[PDB]
Amino acid sequence: GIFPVACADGYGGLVTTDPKTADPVYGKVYNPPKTNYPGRFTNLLDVAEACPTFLRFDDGKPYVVTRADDTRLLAKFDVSLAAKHMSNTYLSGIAQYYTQYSGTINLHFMFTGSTDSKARYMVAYIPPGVETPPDTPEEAAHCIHAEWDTGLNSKFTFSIPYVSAADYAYTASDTAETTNVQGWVCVYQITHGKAENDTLLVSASAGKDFELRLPIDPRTQ
Amino acid sequence: GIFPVACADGYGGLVTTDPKTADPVYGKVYNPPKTNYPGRFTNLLDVAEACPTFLRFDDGKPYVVTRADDTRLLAKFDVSLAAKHMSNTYLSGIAQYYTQYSGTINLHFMFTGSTDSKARYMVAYIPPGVETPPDTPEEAAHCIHAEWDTGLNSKFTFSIPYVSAADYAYTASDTAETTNVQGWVCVYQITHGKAENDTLLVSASAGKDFELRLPIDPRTQ
Amino acid sequence: SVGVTYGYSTEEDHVAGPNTSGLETRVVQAERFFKKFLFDWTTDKPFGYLTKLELPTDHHGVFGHLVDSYAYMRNGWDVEVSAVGNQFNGGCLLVAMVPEWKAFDTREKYQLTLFPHQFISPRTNMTAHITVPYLGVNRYDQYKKHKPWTLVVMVLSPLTVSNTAAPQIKVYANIAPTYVHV
Amino acid sequence: SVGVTYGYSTEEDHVAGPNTSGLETRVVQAERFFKKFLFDWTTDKPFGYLTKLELPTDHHGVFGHLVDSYAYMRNGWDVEVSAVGNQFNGGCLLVAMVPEWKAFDTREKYQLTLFPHQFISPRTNMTAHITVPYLGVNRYDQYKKHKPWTLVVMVLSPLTVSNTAAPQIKVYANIAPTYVHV
Amino acid sequence: RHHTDVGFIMDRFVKINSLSPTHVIDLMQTHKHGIVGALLRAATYYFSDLEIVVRHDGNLTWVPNGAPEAALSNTSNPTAYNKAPFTRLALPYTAPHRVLATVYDGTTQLPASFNYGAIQAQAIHELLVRMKRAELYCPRPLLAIKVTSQDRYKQKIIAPA
Amino acid sequence: RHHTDVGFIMDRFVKINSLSPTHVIDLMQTHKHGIVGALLRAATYYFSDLEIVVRHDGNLTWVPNGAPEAALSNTSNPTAYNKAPFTRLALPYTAPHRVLATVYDGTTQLPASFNYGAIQAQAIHELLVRMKRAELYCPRPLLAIKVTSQDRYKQKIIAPA
């Protein structure tokens, strides 16, 4: 009364991604349920929302050298997913273990001078291929820009729209072309009020949109 | 009309813990049901509740040498799950076949002098690391202690709370550190009334709490 | 007294049954107490002094008549142990109901009380009292070749004396089967 | 003020429980603030100047009495940090609540704010205020061999001075356990 | 409490020392400190079903108790043939008694009754045995390792590096 | 959002360097940049079930924690026998603590507690391990590759011809 042994012709590989399971052996063992313990989480993303980050400039000093005089240009960095401006960065490491990624990106700003001091600044996006960085607030504005002041607020969070070629992109960058993937998106300012020595901070973080597809080791394990 | 022979890639080990079963052969055979036979049980624990035990001191005499004079210190033993004080002990052997164990531990006391004789004694716990055994009832008491008398009762059962590092511990002890795992938990007394020669007995047993996790042979089978 | 303490159960039993039970019914008059000598116990014996007693000895009783009848049988067992003394003694002896007795060894001594039991000290008890319900390999038994039980006592505490007491004590016990079916 | 900012949760807690909790109840009078010295901070220290503080130091308190009692225990922790200055200063310091502290290294510095935290600059805050609910490997703990927590601060911005300010500032903080069970 | 109810303890295997072209099958053949029999020996009366495993050659073959041994190879009372390398069978109880036990004092050699039996072949190496649904009656004394040195006891423990 | 909830990330394998006729079993034995442990090391406290795979010979055999190592080969606490070439088991948690972790500052050697344990055989080559249903608590710092050259970073990419 055998059932037809519809044997397997060549499948069933002991391989990586698999969802197959196993047999408990010294099994049938409880544990005190670990609910109500603090520090629970699931998402690298979501925990990367409430937590901001920092940045870096060649001066190795995380904060921004913030000259306060007739100068107009502040400083210009880049935002890849992997760039000297953004190595030591809670996103990238989490990022660099991936290839596909999508969605908006976050930033922050923290002021330094005494509140009394009036001020002006201007965040500004630049698309990868304008062929020339802007050199004046209003013509910079043509791409993307906004404002704030010392007045009525000190913090701020900003975002660049997830422009790309396709609705996704490569995490690492290529050694087969030239054009920067994003640009040199950075900040302008109107007349400094007064300061003996300012300073600026800046971060990035996950928000409504920071997403990924996935995954492989790059490193030399 | 074969069913897809989704063959097995590398599983199904003839190994130890397994729950798999077999095929009766000269089978289909009854037996007179063995109910109503006495002496039924299931639990090493539970049968280790109603049954007390004994102990041992270097005198190889199970009972306690119970000097009856101006002395204050009675004698001091230890209670591991494996210790010279507690080898020949219905728990340990059952225990020594395990590694994880938890829950309170039991004791007993049986008096020897004639009932008329007044008496005083004081059980007392000591935590593993007080760095000094107590030397007076009231300062001993600071850890844990209690009383009774010859009066109105002769038996007694006592318990130490299952203090530990974690909510479990190792059965065998280590050869990598010094501090005793439990202490030297033992007994004091107030003025002996009168006795030419006393004697004390003492046991251990399972109770509401004596538990285990499990198991491996240690021995040299 | 501490009163009866049962071995594994306390209940009125099946008494009438099948062919052999019909053929080997409850012959009640087969029942009668008597007394056996146990041992001596003075300040001499240190701990571990075992003393065993196989069961059941011959006996000039109707029971004893049949226990030679050399036949399939079953039985019960009721034990009542004591040793008269006086309230100035002191110590602790151990009475024991052993299934399938074997020659023990020093270490295991410290284990006895697995079995049903009581304590022996002139304060608490003066009358041990213990009953084992039947058991055995077959549904019945034929003694001569085998002994399913024995009645053993051994030291559990050294024995004390003052001038007021009696420097020697004898120890008796009560042995009589019950619930007999032959 | 910015007001309280909680670590991972904000809720009234379980206070009374099982045998040890019954044996190690909420001894409320074990609680009392005090002050610790933190560090100095002038125009000297460039960025990265770490300064750590293991917990908890000895203390002549009823708490401090028991933290030598060398026993299974649990605890809470409430942090309130500040450093008085004057509105002409400028910079940014970073206060930090670290679980299982380890010796860091240069690169990871730029990551700190994973942990719960606030900002330190004479404008926004004048009173840090932070609380960690308990945790640990066991349901309880015995300190001397271990430290489940530490209270650390490190540079987050170079410090500025004009003539109007005070060229030195001391930094205090507030340390006292809460919710104690022993 | 979720162990030391035998129903989980005695469903493993245990090596047996001896063999021969024929070989009696019994529990008391086990080692008297293998964790299997300790509990077993720790009791007076026990019953179970039975499962056995044999790595072998030729033609493993088995007979229940109360049988003339002289008549095994012939006519092949039940069996299935060779197949390497694992082979797993289970026997149901057969003994003439409503229960087994460990030792039977009668005027100390083990009785000729409690006999799961024996198997026979032309080449026999390895033996695995197994207890099913078992139950035990009147637990018996039991020992642990003996104490020689001073403190409590000492023993090596595994650990990484 | 349909990743970076560990429930999908940490259910793969990872090589382990060392072996010996006996061999401790632990996560921190993993390489500190293998993508497995990064996330693991990226956290403070974590728990899971556990699954393991070993290509080996002889008789693979395993014991849970808190046990006298000296007593493995004898009496064979649970196991199943040899079979080439894949062999796949899973162990359930056993440690005396309601959670694991990565590093435990006490006056920097890893503690003697967090111990999935060890296995033993006569010949051991390859090791595969696996995390089940896991969860993590208080994520910890984390690094990426370091920046040396000028622009952003450079790296080769595969492509057809």
Numbering used by the authors:
A (entry chain I), B (entry chain 3): 1 to 221
C (entry chain 2), D (entry chain H): 29 to 210
E (entry chain 1), F (entry chain G): 27 to 133, 155 to 208
From the paper:
The virus forms an icosahedral capsid from 60 copies each of the viral proteins, VP0, VP1 and VP3, organised in the form of twelve pentamers. VP1–3 are surface exposed, each adopting an 8-stranded β-barrel conformation with extended N and C-termini, with VP1 surrounding the 5-fold axes of symmetry, and VP2 and VP3 alternating around the icosahedral 3-fold axes. In the acidic environment of the endocytic compartments the virus particle dissociates into pentamers, releasing the RNA into the cell to produce viral progeny.
The dissociated pentamers appeared to be hydrophobic, since they stuck to the carbon support of the cryo-EM grids or aggregated. Due to the limitation of having only a few thousand particles (the majority of which were side views) this structure was determined only to low resolution (8 Å). For the isolated pentamers 4,260 particles led to a reconstruction at a final resolution of 8.2 Å using the same criterion. The density for the isolated pentamer correlated extremely well with density for a pentamer cut out from the inside-out shell (CC = 0.88), and at the resolution of the analysis no structural rearrangements were obvious. In neither of the reconstructions was density observed for VP4, so it was omitted from the native PDB coordinate fitting. Furthermore, no density was observed for the N-terminal VP2 hairpin loop of the native structure. Indeed Burroughs et al showed that VP4 is absent from sucrose density purified pentamers and our initial cryo-EM data on the reassembled particles was derived from material purified in exactly this way. This finding was confirmed by the higher correlation seen between our fitted inside-out pentamer structure and the density of the standalone pentamer, than between that of the native pentamer with this density.
